[PDB]
Write an enzyme that holds these catalytic residues in place. Structure first.
Site, PDB file in Angstrom:
ATOM      1  N   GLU A  18     -24.533  11.165  -5.141  1.00  0.00           N
ATOM      2  CA  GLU A  18     -23.767  11.803  -5.881  1.00  0.00           C
ATOM      3  C   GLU A  18     -24.382  11.547  -7.594  1.00  0.00           C
ATOM      4  O   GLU A  18     -24.333  12.698  -8.534  1.00  0.00           O
ATOM      5  CB  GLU A  18     -22.909  12.824  -6.002  1.00  0.00           C
ATOM      6  CG  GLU A  18     -22.303  13.474  -4.560  1.00  0.00           C
ATOM      7  CD  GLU A  18     -22.649  14.235  -3.925  1.00  0.00           C
ATOM      8  OE1 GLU A  18     -23.464  15.233  -3.954  1.00  0.00           O
ATOM      9  OE2 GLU A  18     -22.004  14.073  -2.894  1.00  0.00           O
TER      10      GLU A  18
ATOM     11  N   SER B 295      32.881  14.435  29.240  1.00  0.00           N
ATOM     12  CA  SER B 295      33.733  13.514  29.714  1.00  0.00           C
ATOM     13  C   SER B 295      33.616  12.930  27.847  1.00  0.00           C
ATOM     14  O   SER B 295      34.608  11.443  27.422  1.00  0.00           O
ATOM     15  CB  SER B 295      33.858  12.545  30.245  1.00  0.00           C
ATOM     16  OG  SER B 295      34.161  13.216  31.548  1.00  0.00           O
TER      17      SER B 295
HETATM   18  C1  LIG Z   1      32.661  13.434  31.982  1.00  0.00           C
HETATM   19  O1  LIG Z   1      32.035  14.271  31.588  1.00  0.00           O
HETATM   20  C2  LIG Z   1      33.241  14.099  33.264  1.00  0.00           C
HETATM   21  N1  LIG Z   1      33.098  15.270  33.785  1.00  0.00           N
HETATM   22  C3  LIG Z   1      33.744  16.243  33.584  1.00  0.00           C
HETATM   23  O2  LIG Z   1      35.048  16.584  32.854  1.00  0.00           O
HETATM   24  C4  LIG Z   1      33.906  17.941  34.073  1.00  0.00           C
HETATM   25  N2  LIG Z   1      33.371  18.500  34.872  1.00  0.00           N
HETATM   26  O3  LIG Z   1      33.587  17.305  36.087  1.00  0.00           O
HETATM   27  C5  LIG Z   1      33.365  18.325  37.124  1.00  0.00           C
HETATM   28  C6  LIG Z   1      34.977  17.541  38.165  1.00  0.00           C
HETATM   29  C7  LIG Z   1      34.618  19.480  36.840  1.00  0.00           C
HETATM   30  C8  LIG Z   1      32.368  18.806  38.140  1.00  0.00           C
HETATM   31  O4  LIG Z   1      32.668  19.704  38.498  1.00  0.00           O
HETATM   32  O5  LIG Z   1      31.271  17.804  38.023  1.00  0.00           O
HETATM   33  C9  LIG Z   1      33.738  18.992  32.606  1.00  0.00           C
HETATM   34  C10 LIG Z   1      34.486  19.007  31.551  1.00  0.00           C
HETATM   35  S1  LIG Z   1      33.695  19.783  30.754  1.00  0.00           S
HETATM   36  C11 LIG Z   1      32.977  20.807  31.465  1.00  0.00           C
HETATM   37  N3  LIG Z   1      31.818  21.815  31.238  1.00  0.00           N
HETATM   38  N4  LIG Z   1      32.803  19.793  32.596  1.00  0.00           N
HETATM   39  C12 LIG Z   1      32.596  13.218  34.480  1.00  0.00           C
HETATM   40  C13 LIG Z   1      33.347  13.392  36.211  1.00  0.00           C
HETATM   41  N5  LIG Z   1      32.799  11.971  34.021  1.00  0.00           N
HETATM   42  S2  LIG Z   1      31.153  11.352  33.984  1.00  0.00           S
HETATM   43  O6  LIG Z   1      31.461   9.484  33.898  1.00  0.00           O
HETATM   44  O7  LIG Z   1      30.488  11.478  35.634  1.00  0.00           O
HETATM   45  O8  LIG Z   1      30.422  11.481  33.139  1.00  0.00           O
END
Ligand SMILES: *C(=O)[C@@H](NC(=O)/C(=N\OC(C)(C)C(=O)O)c1csc(N)n1)[C@H](C)NS(=O)(=O)O
Ligand SMILES: C=C(C/C=C(/C)CCC=C(C)C)CCC(C)(C)/C=C/CC/C(C)=C\CO[C@H](COP(=O)(O)O[C@H]1O[C@H](C(N)=O)[C@@](C)(O)[C@H](OC(N)=O)[C@H]1O[C@@H]1O[C@H](CO[C@@H]2O[C@H](CO)[C@@H](O)[C@H](O)[C@H]2O)[C@@H](O[C@@H]2O[C@H](C)[C@@H](O[C@@H]3O[C@H](C(=O)NC4=C(O)C=CC4=O)[C@H](O)[C@H](O)[C@H]3O)[C@H](O)[C@H]2NC(C)=O)[C@H](O)[C@H]1NC(C)=O)C(=O)O
Ligand SMILES: C=C(C/C=C(/C)CCC=C(C)C)CCC(C)(C)/C=C/CC/C(C)=C\CO[C@H](COP(=O)(O)O[C@H]1O[C@H](C(N)=O)[C@@](C)(O)[C@H](OC(N)=O)[C@H]1O[C@@H]1O[C@H](CO[C@@H]2O[C@H](CO)[C@@H](O)[C@H](O)[C@H]2O)[C@@H](O[C@@H]2O[C@H](C)[C@@H](O[C@@H]3O[C@H](C(=O)NC4=C(O)C=CC4=O)[C@H](O)[C@H](O)[C@H]3O)[C@H](O)[C@H]2NC(C)=O)[C@H](O)[C@H]1NC(C)=O)C(=O)O
Ligand SMILES: *C(=O)[C@@H](NC(=O)/C(=N\OC(C)(C)C(=O)O)c1csc(N)n1)[C@H](C)NS(=O)(=O)O
EC number: 2.4.99.28
Lengths: 733, 733
Positions: free
Chosen positions: B167, B444
């Site tokens: 330019e 959990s």
């Molecule tokens: C931990 O996360 C734990 N899960 C639970 O306590 C919950 N649900 O697990 C049940 C047994 C009810 C299921 O139907 O699977 C929970 C707490 S609050 C909510 N809305 N659900 C699990 C089993 N432990 S982990 O190590 O597998 O994650």
């Protein structure tokens, strides 16, 4: 430095822009400045000693030609009246035959004729004195700008001063370099601007109107200033205001722009600019600022104050004083015609334009400043217009009708020149011209043709010839039977009538017997020679009684042919067409053609004086017995039409009365058309009809039996004989 | 004459128009030329001898900071790799602590640590070596113009020549008075005009961009010429092109105008203008003519020929030759990131903007040339983004799903400083940021709070404390009965579990019994001290198992509090906010607060290493056994959510996997979130977790019964004791 090097480069191209401006201002001025529309004039009357014209007739003639009655003549176009004379200032007019200036003349009368026309400046008699024509109208120019060019000298020095007293000092070009300094300093800048305050020289105002657009250019005033420096440098102050005084916008006429004082003076006042009064000049000058809102038609209050401001502005400068001020302000502006004056004489103008086409074609509209001289009569027109405007509402009231129309055509008895044309009850506003467009059954106006055909045979048919008046039954080409009846359904006791009485009383049965004895081809030929349109003749017995559809103008030609003593003179509205340089583009000349014998036309005219004195038109005869009018009546079946053909010493007048929808008018005995004619005659000075019998006309006597006698007899009738010794052949019986 | 008098008057007002122009050009230049938008930078890494960083880790760190691997270092921002070292040219950076220039350095490694950082110019060791931050983005300026101001000296003399070779000649102002004569003569006048043909000096192009409108002014070029006469008269050629090189329109980013070479170089190439290659400079210079249609994104063919024209134009003048021509043309333009680069790091930017508001309010957007220094980590982000982009479609395929989303948050273990944030599966294009907006039941992940509350009581609860694992029935305030179950619906044969195993295996029934024994007010208080939002805590038995709805960022704060050994460090993205003059507008400082005892947090972290090695997260433990990661799992009821909280030696990483509509994901055992974390770890170099036990921590032995023993025992567990003679009190039984 260097604001000069390039600042000097600015000087260069703006001066060469100035030589682009000078080279283009010349192109406009050096030749065609405008497309000047055609001037349309009325008849040019020649006053002559011993002329059958009275003092009262002449006043009306003068008034009708834009002349003003005064007590002290000071201006051209004025006149005074004494016991036995008229003193006038015949205005200057560019006559085709010879150009003339002002003439102070005395017209001495000795009732009912003009005795002398004397020039009051040398005490000498005139062999003939010319009357200037009245301007009827202007043929519309395409770019919608109307002008009447008047040179510099045509403008009085007073109107020139009245103008300068409003818009100038005139020591110009440079154009008030100091006005721009004040004009822009007064407002104290700040963008604008209100008020500027009319910072424009006459040379700036001219360039603006002639060369530049409406607005949006603050650049324009400076561009206009640049042009107003060139114009006053190459054109003298005299030319500046010659151009200026013909350009200035002064009024509107619908879609046509009225510009320049010459056409404006006639438009608002009805006088050529040279004849204007000071209050008139002041108004006209004052209008210039704004022509549309200073309208004495729309808002007089505003215009009545402006003119008065110009009156007060003029006294401030040198010329006037309050002795002529207080009165000048008091004088009402107009002097205003009060008419819109959009299209003057529309009915008669159709004929002019039609004739202009036939004689010059197209290559006439190309030309500028053209002058058209017509056959138009102001006195005859005003009388015809008045008879229509007054007669029609009068008839609507008497008979009781919601609608009723009329049509009047006035032509020169001898030359065929058209003097007047009325196209309707409202002639001031017309679009349908019944004088040239209303095709109607003529009725009993068809009767003289048959008698003129018979009387053209002097050895067979005469005024004393007996015609049968008895029941008729005519077998026609369908098998149907034509049985015509007389208006009263009666027949003559003796079963016969004489030719003279058959036409006097407009008898139907005797007109058929005569017509059928001559044969339809013979009567059809008379109609051709009279000048009626060839395509309107349908040769069946019914045409002898009015089965013939004509316009009032076509009827005017037929009756002119007979009123002139047998010479068919083709009807016309054109006397001449002159170019601005004086080149005779068109010049009319006599082209009268011998149609019927002089003696046959005389005997028809004499019989036509009988219809007016003792027959069908006897009501008119008794009102004007000294005029000895030759006429004929017409009433069509079911009172659709009423007609009247009237002949005085100078004119043929065709009056028609009927309804646009072809419905009953309740009028019979030509009552409608005859009473409109009655008014037309009462509205002016008609010429007494004095029949000059041609050669071989001898007044012969007849006995009660209708046979020629040597001496005496109970009845005298004119006869076409070189030797009235048909008397002897008759007397010998 | 007088075209001079008035032609001289033209010179006057155009020179005073010029002093209206000079007085207004100063107003722009003498101060604020533009509204310079804020600069956003990533973390500033300090390299230090004995630092736990390897050669491979450093290459990725350097690459992530806009450094290019080469074989022969010739430019700043380049690096070479040897068997045991890295040789680099640390680019000049305006460091808040101290401004620095280029440094040629050798980083000698002795796996897995950096041994020395030696300056190759003096053979001297650095106590610490600063790494320049990477520019993340620019905070949008309101008038939509984006610029990065670089002074005159920041521009290499080569790019300056490459520009002049296209330019200019630069002997200017007057600006090529002869160019106007040719420029307008070439076209041979006639209105226009095509081609003109680029009749504009650099000082004409500047005034155009800075002061004037787009077009319609043939008046503008002359008005611009008038300005290009003033600028080069009062501003040195050095300032002209300093202003010019920061103004020039060079590209578009939706509704933000990319202008000036400094921001353009980073935009298209990803390097500061000083580091550009010749083929790069040529393209950038060539773009100036038209920046929109010479787009290497839209139409490379066109841009690939233009750059090549600039390559061919440069060889025509002095500098280059075809030896470096043929190859330069062959080199593909980009070097193109291939991303639209509309809004970089949208998820992490929400946090920055939110924090900018909290710390400086409004009166910060008023300022120009602001510098924002963030906690952002390029290595951690790229690894997290990749784990999301790859892990999500992988999981959608395996489990078979139409939709699946994720969210990753990485924070400094000790300081709380946010290093990485992922708001979704498509982090490159985001409007919903799940890291700060997705409120979910933590499941959990709520478990460590209860154990941390119990372990805070060293005389009552220890790792060997027996907890009942038998059926539960809790009467609630509706009459309904809460009967929680363990994930497998089974209970321990003995009807009991130790505290250590209850948390390792995420056992529900033993967590309720412990929580209910401590009481809900106590566990609710730990949550407050951990830093979770006060309004989200609903103290009912269900919260001990996960009836607590948090966003991944809120979860990151809670786990940071425990990972730091009990010190709550409020999370942040802001390190500093500096003005262009160097004024420290905002300076962050350590504000860590003691929340829970050091020993209670240690015992929770040690137990969290057990979940990863032998419990719920054992699949991760076996892949990275040498990292000794402390973690916790989460799976909500009906597989709505999967969670993972992972702790290495340096960071806390919260991974969430779930669906936007809260529907089943078919994933359990934190399989979704755990495998996204697995990828995040595989995508970078994680720091091994080596727990430093605080004071009063003693490794004690227990027999099969869970009772402390003097010597031996089948199990060793850490204990909060100043005198491990709890052994004696136990042994005496
Ligand atoms: C931990 O996360 C734990 N899960 C639970 O306590 C919950 N649900 O697990 C049940 C047994 C009810 C299921 O139907 O699977 C929970 C707490 S609050 C909510 N809305 N659900 C699990 C089993 N432990 S982990 O190590 O597998 O994650
Ligand atoms: O430069 C500036 C130029 O300014 P101009 O406006 O261009 O000049 C007008 O104002 C001058 C001024 N500086 O004060 C002035 C007073 O000196 C002008 O007088 C001059 N030049 O002598 C004055 O000029 C006149 O302007 C008249 C009215 O201007 C009006 O003044 C008001 C301010 O005064 C404004 O508010 C007005 O609206 C502005 O219009 C000119 O009149 C017009 O002239 C036009 C031909 C007319 O247009 C026709 O109008 C017709 C109609 O209305 N019916 C039809 O529509 C037809 O279609 C249409 O063509 C139009 O009807 C007609 N209107 C009026 C009120 O008179 C009239 O046409 C024209 N006269 C001449 C000699 O050229 C300057 O010189 O000053
Ligand atoms: O005086 C005349 C002045 O003429 P200019 O047109 O004003 O200058 C252009 O042409 C010159 C010439 N005399 O030949 C020139 C070639 O010397 C100019 O180069 C210079 N000055 O170095 C050339 O200037 C450039 O004009 C570019 C393109 O001009 C185009 O050229 C064609 C003829 O060459 C015409 O047919 C074009 O249509 C005309 O547009 C300027 O580019 C424009 O710069 C604008 C900022 C861009 O606007 C943005 O576009 C964005 C977008 O498109 N995406 C967005 O819409 C955004 O909203 C919008 O603001 C716009 O997108 C972008 N367009 C292109 C093709 O590059 C670019 O913005 C601008 N460059 C500079 C240094 O000021 C003169 O100096 O010559
Ligand atoms: C003349 O005009 C004449 N009228 C007639 O001949 C016509 N009609 O008159 C009759 C008797 C039919 C009537 O009903 O009134 C006639 C001819 S053509 C046409 N359409 N109608 C009258 C009687 N003579 S005048 O002197 O009265 O006018």
């Amino acid at each position: 430095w260097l604001l000069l090097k390039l600042a000097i480069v600015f000087a260069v191209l703006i001066a060469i822009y100035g030589v682009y401006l000078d080279q283009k201002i010349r192109s406009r001025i050096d030749g065609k400045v405008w497309q000047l529309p055609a001037a349309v004039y009325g008849r040019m009357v020649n006053l002559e000693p011993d002329m059958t014209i009275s003092k009262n007739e002449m006043v009306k003639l003068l008034e009708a030609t834009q002349y003003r009655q005064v007590s002290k003549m000071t201006r051209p176009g004025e006149f005074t009246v004494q016991a036995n004379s008229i003193e006038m200032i015949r205005r200057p007019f560019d006559f085709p035959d010879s150009k003339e200036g002002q003439v102070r003349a005395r017209l001495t009368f000795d009732g009912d004729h003009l005795a002398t026309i004397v020039n009051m400046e040398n005490n000498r008699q005139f062999g003939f004195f010319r009357l200037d024509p009245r301007l009827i109208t202007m043929i519309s120019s395409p770019n919608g700008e109307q002008r009447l060019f008047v040179p510099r000298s045509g403008f009085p020095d007073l109107l020139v001063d009245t103008l300068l007293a409003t818009e100038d000092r005139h020591f110009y070009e440079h154009d008030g370099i100091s006005l721009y300094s004040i004009g822009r300093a007064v407002l104290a800048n700040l963008t604008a601007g209100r008020t500027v305050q009319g910072a424009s020289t006459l040379t700036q105002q001219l360039v603006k109107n002639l060369f530049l657009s409406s607005e949006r250019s603050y650049w324009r005033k400076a561009n206009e200033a640049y042009m107003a420096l060139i114009m006053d440098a190459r054109y003298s102050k005299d030319r500046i205001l010659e151009l200026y005084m013909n350009e200035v916008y002064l009024g509107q006429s619908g879609d046509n722009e009225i510009r320049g004082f010459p056409l404006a003076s006639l438009y608002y006042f009805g006088r050529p600019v040279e004849e204007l009064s000071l209050d008139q000049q002041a108004l006209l000058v004052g209008m210039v600022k704004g022509a549309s809102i200073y309208n004495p038609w729309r808002n007089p209050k505003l215009a009545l104050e402006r003119r008065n401001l110009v009156l007060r502005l003029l006294q401030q400068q040198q010329i006037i004083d309050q002795e002529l001020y207080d009165m000048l302000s008091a004088r009402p502006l107009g002097v205003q015609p009060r008419g819109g004056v959009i299209s003057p004489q529309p009915a008669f103008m159709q004929l002019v334009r039609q004739e202009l086409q036939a004689k010059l074609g197209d290559k006439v509209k190309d030309l500028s400043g053209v002058k058209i001289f017509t056959t138009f009569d102001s006195v005859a027109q005003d009388a015809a217009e008045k008879a229509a405007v007054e007669g029609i509402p009068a008839l609507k009231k008497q008979r009781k009708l919601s609608d009723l129309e009329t049509a009047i055509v006035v032509v020169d008895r001898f030359s065929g020149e058209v003097r007047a044309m009325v196209g309707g009850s409202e002639p001031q506003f017309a679009g349908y011209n019944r004088a040239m467009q209303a095709r109607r059954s003529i009725g009993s106006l068809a009767k003289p043709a048959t008698y003129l055909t018979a009387l053209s045979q002097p050895k067979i048919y005469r005024l004393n010839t007996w015609i049968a008046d008895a029941p008729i039954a005519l077998r026609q080409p369908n098998g149907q039977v034509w049985s015509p009846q007389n208006d009263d359904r009666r027949y003559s006791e003796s079963g016969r009538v004489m030719l003279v009485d058959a036409l006097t009383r407009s008898m139907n049965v005797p007109t058929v017997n005569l017509g059928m004895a001559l044969g339809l081809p013979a009567v059809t030929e008379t109609w051709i020679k009279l000048g009626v349109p060839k395509d309107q003749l349908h040769p069946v017995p019914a045409m002898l009684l009015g089965a013939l559809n004509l316009t009032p103008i076509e009827v005017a030609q037929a009756f002119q042919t007979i009123a002139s003593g047998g010479n068919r003179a083709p009807l016309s509205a054109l006397r001449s067409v002159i170019a601005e340089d004086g080149k005779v583009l068109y010049q009319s000349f006599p082209q009268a053609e011998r149609a019927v014998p002089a003696q046959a036309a005389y005997l028809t005219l004499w019989t036509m004086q009988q219809v007016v004195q003792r027959g069908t038109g006897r009501q008119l005869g008794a009102k004007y017995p000294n005029l000895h009018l030759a006429g004929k009546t017409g009433t069509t079946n079911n009172n659709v039409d009423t007609w009247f053909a009237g002949i005085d010493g100078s004119t043929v007048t065709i009056t028609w009365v009927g309804r646009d929808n072809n419905q009953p008018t309740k009028l019979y005995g030509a009552s409608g058309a005859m009473s409109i004619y009655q008014r037309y005659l009462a509205n002016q000075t008609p010429t007494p009809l004095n029949l000059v019998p041609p050669e071989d006309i001898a007044d012969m006597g007849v006995d009660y039996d209708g046979n020629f006698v040597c001496s005496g007899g109970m009845r005298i009738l004119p006869v076409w004989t070189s030797d009235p010794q048909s008397l002897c052949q008759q007397s010998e019986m």
